Amino acid sequence: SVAAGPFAHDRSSVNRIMLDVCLALTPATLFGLVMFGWPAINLWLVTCVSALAIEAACLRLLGQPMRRLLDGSALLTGWLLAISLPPWAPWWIGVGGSLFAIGIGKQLYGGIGQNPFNPAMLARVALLIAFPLQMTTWALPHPLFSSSAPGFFDSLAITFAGAPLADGMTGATALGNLKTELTLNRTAQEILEGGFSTISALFGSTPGSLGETSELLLLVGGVWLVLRRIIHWEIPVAILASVFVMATLAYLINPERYAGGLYQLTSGGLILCAFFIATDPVTSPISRVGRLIFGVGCGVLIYVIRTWGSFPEAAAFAVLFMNALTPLIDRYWRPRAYGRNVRGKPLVA
């Protein structure tokens, strides 16, 4: 057997890409771990380790090389799922999420590069549908080493086993609170005047998911990813612009019922989804117009299901729907060739 060319390469690798994504996620992950305390650390470690172990088992069953474990595509899935989960969640929530993602969502279709849906978001949706009580309990920020957060073994009892969180440690967030108070015949202004501060919401000093809370360190990480040419700006720009424009229009039309702009941007996992999750290379279009369509659809779906839907946030549902729509976009928006028109016929000259 002879060797074919080319005999040059740019030293690129999948491991570098995945580890760079993890490094970008690192600062917001640390901010979330410090803010919520030890149970967040326990859940994060459990989710990541379970994801890696299940990936190794699935690779062993399928006969694939164990070196596929070293590219970090499973650690990244576990990381994103763990930072997408509530902070003070039980261990079995994380273990089941990792099992449902790495497994059905990824390894049952062949492995990396073969699945049609986002694994982490698939696991998140499955957990929310199957276990709605454990996925809707948001703990207030109890900073590490603050004399009010539970200790090490108390946090062990909180995460493993079933020690109750007592009283006064669980609060309501922003989106769900706004929707509930709107159902309480209060206009959209009084709810936000005395129950929402943009400065504290943008920094990340509010209850929420593990890494979703801070919409600034996530922005820094996404900007670093964009500059390093790992992701394309089309999807984040389109998602954020669509959400902001729709929110501003609805605020201008009916200010007493719709909240728009800064409130929508600095709430939920919109920035995390736009930068780190909606930009999944395997389940996103390979074109430019295709990526723009993907982003605009994601933003429109997110806003529509936020405002009029039955969920406080629909980043996962929007991402899954657009992952379903991806193949048609790929096959109907191919780039133009050389010496041919957009229809594929040879140029005339």
Ligand X SMILES: CCCCCCCCCCCCO[C@@H]1O[C@H](CO)[C@@H](O[C@H]2O[C@H](CO)[C@@H](O)[C@H](O)[C@H]2O)[C@H](O)[C@H]1O
Ligand Y SMILES: CCCCCCCCCCCCCCCCCCCC(=O)O[C@H](COC(=O)CCCCCCCCCCCCCC)COP(=O)(O)OCCN
Ligand Z SMILES: Cc1cc2nc3c(=O)[nH]c(=O)nc-3n(C[C@H](O)[C@H](O)[C@H](O)CO)c2cc1C
Binding residues: 73, 77, 113, 115, 118, 120, 173-176, 209, 269, 280, 316
Phi–psi pair at 278, nearest 5 degrees: -70, -10
Q: Which does 107 bind (CB under 5 to 8 A by kind): ligand Z, ligand Y, ligand X, none?
A: ligand Y
Q: 23, 26, 60, 136: which one contacts another protein (CB under 8 A)?
A: 136
Q: How far apart are CA 21 and CA 225, in angstroms?
A: 7
Site for ligand Z in 146-175 (CB under 6 A): none
186: left (phi > 0), else alpha (psi -120 to 50), else beta? beta
Q: Name which of residues 103 to 132 contact another protein (CB under 8 A).
A: 104-105, 108-114, 116-117, 122, 125-126, 129-132
How far apart CA 339 and CA 163 sit, in angstroms, is: 69
- Residue 62, H or E segment: helix 38-62
For residue 162, the partner it binds in ligand Z, ligand X, another protein, none, with Cβ less than 5 to 8 A by kind, is ligand X
Binding residues for riboflavin: 73, 77, 113, 115, 118, 120, 280
Q: Which residues bind ligand Y (CB under 6 A)?
A: 58, 61-63, 99, 103-104, 107-108
User: Cα–Cα distances in Å, from 32 out to 39, 99, 202, 206?
Assistant: 11, 23, 13, 11
Judged by CB under 8 A, the number of residues near another protein is 79
Of residues 279-308, those binding another protein (CB under 8 A): 281-282, 284, 286-287, 304-305, 308
Residue 46 touches which of ligand Y, ligand X, ligand Z, none (Cβ within 5-8 Å per kind): ligand X
**Is 135 within 8 Å of 84 (Cβ atoms)?**
no
Residue 92: exposure state from Cβ atoms within 10 A (0-12, 13-18, ≥19): middle
Strand partners, 139: 170
Looking at the Cβ atoms of 106 and 142, the one nearer to ligand Z is: 106
Q: Which residues bind ligand Z (CB under 6 A)?
A: 17, 21, 73, 76-77, 80, 106, 112, 115, 118-120, 230-231, 276-277, 279-283
